[PDB]
């Protein structure tokens, strides 16, 4: 059966990657929150 996660690195990096985050203010808030919590990995990017 086809499950929901169908990986594509391009789609991953465009949907949830660093530069997508940076492109909107709500995306930059996501990063701010994640830096404040002290997340080792800010984005899917890495």
- Residue 1 vs 40, nearer CB to RNA: 1
Dihedral sign for Cα atoms in the order 11, 15, 16, 20? positive
Footprint of RNA on residues 1-46 (CB under 7 A)? 1-11, 14-15, 23, 25
Minimum distance of RNA from residue 9's CB (angstroms)? 3
In whole angstroms, give the CA distance from residue 30 to residue 25: 9
Minimum distance of RNA from residue 16's CB (angstroms)? 9
Q: Which residues contact 1 (CB under 8 A, 6 or more apart)?
A: none
- Interface residue list for RNA (CB under 7 A): 1-11, 14-15, 23, 25
């Amino acid at each position: 059966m086809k499950r929901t996660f169908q990986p594509s690195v391009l789609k991953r990096n465009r949907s949830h990657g660093f530069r997508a985050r940076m492109a909107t203010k709500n995306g930059r808030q996501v990063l701010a929150r994640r830096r404040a919590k002290g997340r080792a990995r800010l984005t899917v990017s890495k």
